[PDB]
Every structure is written in structure tokens, then in C-alpha cells.
Amino acid sequence: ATQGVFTLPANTQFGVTAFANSAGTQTVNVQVNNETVATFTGQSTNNAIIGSKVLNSGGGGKVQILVSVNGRSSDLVSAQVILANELNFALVGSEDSTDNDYNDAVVVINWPLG
Amino acid sequence: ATQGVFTLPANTQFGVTAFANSAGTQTVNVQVNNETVATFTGQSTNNAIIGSKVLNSGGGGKVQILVSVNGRSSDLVSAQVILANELNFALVGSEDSTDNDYNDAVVVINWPLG
Amino acid sequence: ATQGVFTLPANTQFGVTAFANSAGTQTVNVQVNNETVATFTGQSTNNAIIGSKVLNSGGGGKVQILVSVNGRSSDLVSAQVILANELNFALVGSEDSTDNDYNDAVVVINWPLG
Amino acid sequence: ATQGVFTLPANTQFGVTAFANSAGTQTVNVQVNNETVATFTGQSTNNAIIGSKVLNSGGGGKVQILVSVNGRSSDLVSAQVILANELNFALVGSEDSTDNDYNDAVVVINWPLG
Ligand SMILES: CC(=O)N[C@H]1[C@H](O[C@@H]2[C@@H](O)[C@H](O)O[C@H](CO)[C@@H]2O)O[C@H](CO)[C@@H](O[C@@H]2O[C@H](CO)[C@H](O)[C@H](O)[C@H]2O)[C@@H]1O[C@@H]1O[C@@H](C)[C@@H](O)[C@@H](O)[C@@H]1O
Ligand SMILES: CC(=O)N[C@H]1[C@H](O[C@@H]2[C@@H](O)[C@H](O)O[C@H](CO)[C@@H]2O)O[C@H](CO)[C@@H](O[C@@H]2O[C@H](CO)[C@H](O)[C@H](O)[C@H]2O)[C@@H]1O[C@@H]1O[C@@H](C)[C@@H](O)[C@@H](O)[C@@H]1O
Ligand SMILES: CC(=O)N[C@H]1[C@H](O[C@@H]2[C@@H](O)[C@H](O)O[C@H](CO)[C@@H]2O)O[C@H](CO)[C@@H](O[C@@H]2O[C@H](CO)[C@H](O)[C@H](O)[C@H]2O)[C@@H]1O[C@@H]1O[C@@H](C)[C@@H](O)[C@@H](O)[C@@H]1O
Ligand SMILES: CC(=O)N[C@H]1[C@H](O[C@@H]2[C@@H](O)[C@H](O)O[C@H](CO)[C@@H]2O)O[C@H](CO)[C@@H](O[C@@H]2O[C@H](CO)[C@H](O)[C@H](O)[C@H]2O)[C@@H]1O[C@@H]1O[C@@H](C)[C@@H](O)[C@@H](O)[C@@H]1O
Ligand SMILES: [Ca+2]
Ligand SMILES: [Ca+2]
Numbered sequence: 001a002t003q004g005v006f007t008l009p010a011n012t013q014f015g016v017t018a019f020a021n022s023a024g025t026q027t028v029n030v031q032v033n034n035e036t037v038a039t040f041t042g043q044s045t046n047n048a049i050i051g052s053k054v055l056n057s058g059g060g061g062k063v064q065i066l067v068s069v070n071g072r073s074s075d076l077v078s079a080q081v082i083l084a085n086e087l088n089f090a091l092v093g094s095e096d097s098t099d100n101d102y103n104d105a106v107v108v109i110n111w112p113l114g
Numbered sequence: 115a116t117q118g119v120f121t122l123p124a125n126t127q128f129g130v131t132a133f134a135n136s137a138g139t140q141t142v143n144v145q146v147n148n149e150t151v152a153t154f155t156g157q158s159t160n161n162a163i164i165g166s167k168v169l170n171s172g173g174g175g176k177v178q179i180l181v182s183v184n185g186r187s188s189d190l191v192s193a194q195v196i197l198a199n200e201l202n203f204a205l206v207g208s209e210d211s212t213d214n215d216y217n218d219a220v221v222v223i224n225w226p227l228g
Numbered sequence: 229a230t231q232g233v234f235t236l237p238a239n240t241q242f243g244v245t246a247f248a249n250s251a252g253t254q255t256v257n258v259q260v261n262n263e264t265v266a267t268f269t270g271q272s273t274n275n276a277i278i279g280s281k282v283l284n285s286g287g288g289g290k291v292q293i294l295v296s297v298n299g300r301s302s303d304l305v306s307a308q309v310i311l312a313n314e315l316n317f318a319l320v321g322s323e324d325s326t327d328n329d330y331n332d333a334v335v336v337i338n339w340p341l342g
Numbered sequence: 343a344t345q346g347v348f349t350l351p352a353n354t355q356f357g358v359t360a361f362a363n364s365a366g367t368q369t370v371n372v373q374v375n376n377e378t379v380a381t382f383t384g385q386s387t388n389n390a391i392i393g394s395k396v397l398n399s400g401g402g403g404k405v406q407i408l409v410s411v412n413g414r415s416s417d418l419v420s421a422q423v424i425l426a427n428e429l430n431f432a433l434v435g436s437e438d439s440t441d442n443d444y445n446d447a448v449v450v451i452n453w454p455l456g
């Protein structure tokens with residue numbers, strides 16, 4: 001299945017935060033309605049935050065996360081969870097290698113904000 | 115039900131990150147096996163990160179999140195999600211008022227690291 | 229927090245299935261936009277299915293699950309999870325006593341259908 | 343990532359239930375520690391339960407779900423969610439065609455029982 005693609009409500013502010021846990025430098029691309037609106041880059045084996053931004057979901061509400069290590073696409077896994085019928089998390093794990101820890105870049109999207 | 119309480123694997127390094135979305139200054143307490151090991155304090159209405167730390171789960175693996183605003187406990191909601199049978203998120207939302215956005219402090223716990 | 233309340237997409241077919249794991253006979257009330265549309269009653273300590281029905285979320289999309297055992301409301305816990313940005317589960321656990329297994333009646337709501 | 347594979351607690355009773363939503367007859371294979379222990383077959387476009395069983399996770403706790411339609415493997419998506427630090431769901435969607443509703447066979451695994 002395609003992973004890392006989420007439909008948010010239109011015109012909604014959301015947070016995106018990425019963490020790194022790999023020898024490789026991670027590149028996290030964030031697309032909103034098919035345009036790149038943020039790129040986070042960094043390297044850590046101890047969960048450093050390599051980027052955190054507030055974005056708007058725009059007209060279509062489509063948010064897509066892509067992860068690469070020097071242009072090689074990582075394998076992704078994702079899901080969305082809703083608490084209290086209101087608080088949303090869109091979650092991505094990624095794997096750059098063969099150990100299948102899926103933490104090499106971890107991306108958390110949250111809404112609503114404010 | 116009790117919310118904000120999670121069993122991690124024993125003696126395991128994990129990440130904890132807190133975001134704020136409220137007029138009120140948020141105080142986030144992290145307990146590991148019933149002892150306070152970290153406290154985050156901050157204020158934002160735009161999802162600012164008010165703390166991020168790496169901790170060890172200790173003998174029992176018990177991690178509890180508590181959130182208060184000027185000493186008044188917020189109402190919590192939580193769940194744990196596991197992706198690819200490996201990547202774990204323990205998720206907390208909190209509500210300091212009556213609008214029930216449950217984002218007033220948002221806490222994300224992730225493991226494994228490295 | 230209030231639990232067991234979900235906003236589904238409007239006018240959508242959905243499944244609701246209930247499982248029992250308790251000495252006590254479970255009564256599961258399903259409301260759609262604030263009207264009772266199904267009641268499931270049954271007893272099992274081995275996960276028997278005490279009801280499964282197809283319902284429609286109607287104009288407001290509001291779905292609420294309530295559980296009681298011989299006239300006592302059970303304590304609820306709930307969340308919603310979305311896979312492949314499409315497959316939705318709304319999940320309820322309930323507790324009729326003090327052991328906190330939260331499985332005494334388990335309710336699974338799934339959509340889309342067809 | 344491999345999907346539909348879960349590590350349950352070892353030696354634990356669990357429920358497995360499958361629903362069908364497709365023109366195609368679904369075949370759901372349940373393996374426990376690499377051995378087939380249940381097969382559910384059926385056809386519905388209205389969420390009929392095509393099987394529900396109680397199983398034990400055995401020494402390794404490994405549970406794998408596989409889905410095929412007339413011998414062709416469906417594409418799987420899965421996650422595990424935990425409520426109240428106690429109630430577990432392992433969730434599987436599958437897609438037998440190109441519409442990506444991922445509901446063609448839906449499989450719910452729940453524990454603890456009793
Ligand atoms: C992206 C990366 O760092 N992956 C692997 C690393 O793989 C790189 C390739 O990506 C690159 O293209 O070629 C080089 C050789 O020129 C290399 O193969 O390989 C290292 C070393 O094997 C591996 O780190 C080791 O991972 C094992 C677990 O499999 C173990 O942790 C060991 O201690 C590490 O040294 C990289 O794996 C990534 O980083 C690790 C630190 C760990 O976080 C893994 O989960 C990552 O996938
Ligand atoms: C902790 C906090 O700031 N909560 C409310 C705030 O509540 C305070 C009480 O905590 C205090 O004890 O008493 C005072 C009055 O004496 C007050 O009731 O009230 C403010 C103003 O109403 C409220 O912010 C408003 O929230 C609404 C939505 O309900 C809306 O966003 C408006 O723009 C706000 O000004 C505080 O609500 C929190 O902060 C908001 C910005 C929002 O993030 C809410 O979700 C928070 O719960
Ligand atoms: C609803 C129910 O069956 N609850 C308890 C049960 O409680 C009932 C009261 O609800 C009723 O008001 O009074 C009767 C006496 O007339 C009784 O107190 O009590 C039984 C017996 O204690 C209890 O089952 C036992 O539960 C323990 C775990 O706490 C353990 O499994 C033991 O083997 C059981 O015999 C009922 O608990 C429920 O059913 C259990 C089988 C189990 O599924 C629990 O999770 C349930 O909550
Ligand atoms: C397994 C199955 O029934 N899949 C499709 C079905 O696909 C079959 C192939 O599996 C087979 O190998 O080849 C034949 C041609 O010989 C055929 O292509 O095709 C039917 C008809 O198109 C399709 O049902 C239709 O699906 C659309 C949406 O794409 C819509 O619901 C329409 O009303 C259906 O008639 C099968 O799709 C499956 O069943 C549907 C009812 C639906 O539940 C889909 O999600 C399923 O994937
Ligand atoms: Ca890796
Ligand atoms: Ca790693």
C-alpha cells in the first residue's frame with residue numbers, strides 16, 4: 001500500500017516533527033497538495049529532532065511524507081489515530097536498511113493546533 | 115480508565131516530546147516506575163516544543179505522563195500504536211478547559227531509538 | 229474524557245460488532261445521531277460475538293456506544309485508527325468491575341463497507 | 343514493510359474475526375508460530391463475518407494473517423493499537439483489486455480474553 005499520505009481537513013493548521021535514529025543523514029520531504037513545503041535534513045542515532053514546523057493543509061488537505069537517504073527512498077509505514085474524537089496524529093516510520101527498526105526517520109503530524 | 119500510563123520494554127531508551135497549544139502554561143511531568151524523572155514547562159498557541167528528552171524505562175518499564183496548568187490537573191487521553199510490529203508510539207492529549215480540543219499539551223513517546 | 233463517541237463520515241454504511249468477555253451479561257446500546265438504532269445483549273467469557281449489524285451514519289455521522297451490565301454503566305475507553313488513509317476502525321473497550329481488563333464488552337466499528 | 347505479522351504475548355488466548363467486503367471470495371489464513379491454525383473463506387459485499395475463532399499465541403507469540411482471493415495474494419495493511427495499557431487490537435486491511443478501499447477482507451485480532 002502507499003504509506004505516508006494523509007487527508008487532513010481543508011485549511012487546517014498542523015504540526016510536523018521529525019526525529020532521526022540512523023547512521024545515515026535523513027531527508028524528510030513534506031508535500032501539501034502535491035507541492036513541497038518543507039524539507040528536514042539531519043543525522044542522529046539518539047532521536048534528535050531534525051525539524052518541526054507549522055503548516056496549513058490548504059484546499060485539498062493532502063499531506064504526504066517522503067523519506068530518503070541521499071535520494072534513495074526509505075520504506076515507509078504509517079497510520080492515523082484519533083483520540084477524544086478530536087485529537088489527530090498521523091504517524092510515519094521509515095527504514096533505510098535491513099534491520100527493520102523503522103525508526104531511521106520518525107515523523108509525527110498533529111492537529112488541531114491552537 | 116486511567117490514561118497516560120504505558121508499559122514499555124524494560125531498561126529501554128525512549129524519546130519523550132511535548133508540544134503546547136493553549137493560553138495556559140503547561141507543566142508536563144514524566145514518571146518512570148513511579149518516580150518523576152523529567153518536567154517540561156512552557157507556553158504556546160502554535161505547537162511549540164516545550165521539551166524533548168531521552169530517558170530509560172528502568173526495571174518495570176512503567177511510564178506515566180501527567181499534565182497540569184498552574185497546578186490544576188488537565189484531563190488526559192492516550193493510546194499506544196505499533197507499526198511494522200516494531201515501531202512504537204505512546205500518545206497523550208490533554209484538555210485544560212471546555213473546548214475539548216485535547217491539544218493543550220500533546221505528548222509523544224517513541225521507541226526504539228538508535 | 230467522554231469515550232465511545234465517534235464522528236463518522238456522513239451517510240456512510242458501517243459495521244458494528246460486539247464481543248463479550250465477562251461473567252456478566254453485557255448490554256451494548258448503539259446510538260446514531262442520538263437515537264438508539266441497535267441493542268446487543270449476550271454473555272460469554274470466551275469472546276463470543278453478541279451482535280454484528282450494518283448501520284448507516286446518517287446526516288450528522290454521530291455514533292455513540294454505551295455499555296451496561298444489569299443496570300450499571302461500564303467504564304469505557306476508545307480510539308479511532310485509520311489504515312492506508314482509507315480503512316477506519318472505531319474501537320471501544322469496557323469495564324464492568326475492578327480487574328481493569330477492559331474487555332468485558334469489546335465493540336469494533338468498521339468502514340467503509342462494500 | 344511486511345504487514346499482517348504481530349508479536350502477541352506468548353502463550354495467550356486471543357480472538358480472530360474476519361469480515362468480507364468484495365465481489366471476490368476471500369480466503370484468510372491464520373498462522374501461529376509459522377503453522378496454519380485457521381482458515382476462513384467467504385464472500386460478502388455487506389461486511390459478513392466469514393470466521394471468528396479463539397486461538398492461543400503459543401511459545402513464540404507470532405501471529406500472521408495472509409489473505410488471498412482465488413489464489414492471488416491481496417495487498418495488506420496493519421497496525422496494533424493498545425487502549426488503557428491493557429486492551430489490544432491487531433488490525434489488518436486487504437485489497438484484492440485497484441480501488442484501494444482495503445476492506446476486501448478485514449481482520450480483527452483482540453486480547454486479552456476472558
Ligand atoms: C543509511 C545507513 O546508515 N544504513 C546502515 C549502513 O548502510 C550504509 C548504506 O546506506 C550506504 O549506502 O552504504 C554504506 C557503505 O558504504 C552502508 O552499508 O550500514 C551501517 C553499518 O552496517 C548500518 O549501521 C549499523 O546498523 C546495525 C543494525 O543493522 C547496528 O545498529 C550497527 O551498530 C550499525 O553500525 C546502517 O544502519 C542504520 O544506522 C544504524 C545505526 C541503525 O540505526 C540502523 O537502524 C540504520 O538503518
Ligand atoms: C488554561 C486556559 O488558558 N484555559 C482557557 C482560559 O481559562 C481560564 C481559566 O483557566 C482560569 O482559571 O479562569 C480564566 C477566566 O478567569 C479562564 O476561564 O480561558 C481562555 C479565554 O476564554 C481560553 O482561551 C480561549 O479559548 C477559546 C476556545 O474555548 C478560544 O480559542 C479563544 O480564542 C481563547 O481565547 C483558554 O483556553 C485555552 O487556550 C485557548 C487559546 C485554546 O488553546 C484552548 O483549547 C485552551 O483550552
Ligand atoms: C459483571 C461481573 O460479572 N463482574 C464480576 C462479578 O461481579 C458480580 C457483580 O457485578 C454482581 O453485582 O454481584 C455478583 C455477586 O452476586 C458479583 O459480585 O464477580 C465475579 C466474581 O468475583 C467476577 O468474576 C471474577 O473476576 C475475577 C477477576 O476480577 C476472575 O476472572 C475470576 O475468575 C472471576 O470469577 C466478575 O468479573 C467479570 O467477569 C470475569 C469472568 C472477568 O471477565 C472480569 O474481567 C469481569 O469484569
Ligand atoms: C476480487 C474482485 O472481485 N475484484 C474486482 C473485480 O476484479 C476481477 C478480477 O479479480 C478478475 O481476476 O478479473 C475480472 C475480469 O475478468 C475482474 O476484473 O472486478 C469487479 C468488477 O469491476 C470489481 O467490482 C467492482 O468494483 C468497483 C470499484 O472498483 C465498484 O465497487 C463496482 O460496483 C464493483 O462491481 C471487483 O472489486 C472488488 O469487489 C467490489 C464489489 C469492491 O468491494 C472492491 O473493493 C473489490 O476490490
Ligand atoms: Ca533501520
Ligand atoms: Ca535505526
Ligand SMILES: [Ca+2]
Nearest residue numbers: 210211215218
Ligand atoms: Ca483546550
Ligand SMILES: [Ca+2]
Nearest residue numbers: 114135215218
Ligand atoms: Ca488548545
Ligand SMILES: [Ca+2]
Nearest residue numbers: 324328329332
Ligand atoms: Ca473486567
Ligand SMILES: [Ca+2]
Nearest residue numbers: 249329332456
Ligand atoms: Ca473480562
Ligand SMILES: [Ca+2]
Nearest residue numbers: 438442443446
Ligand atoms: Ca478493494
Ligand SMILES: [Ca+2]
Nearest residue numbers: 342363443446
Ligand atoms: Ca471492497
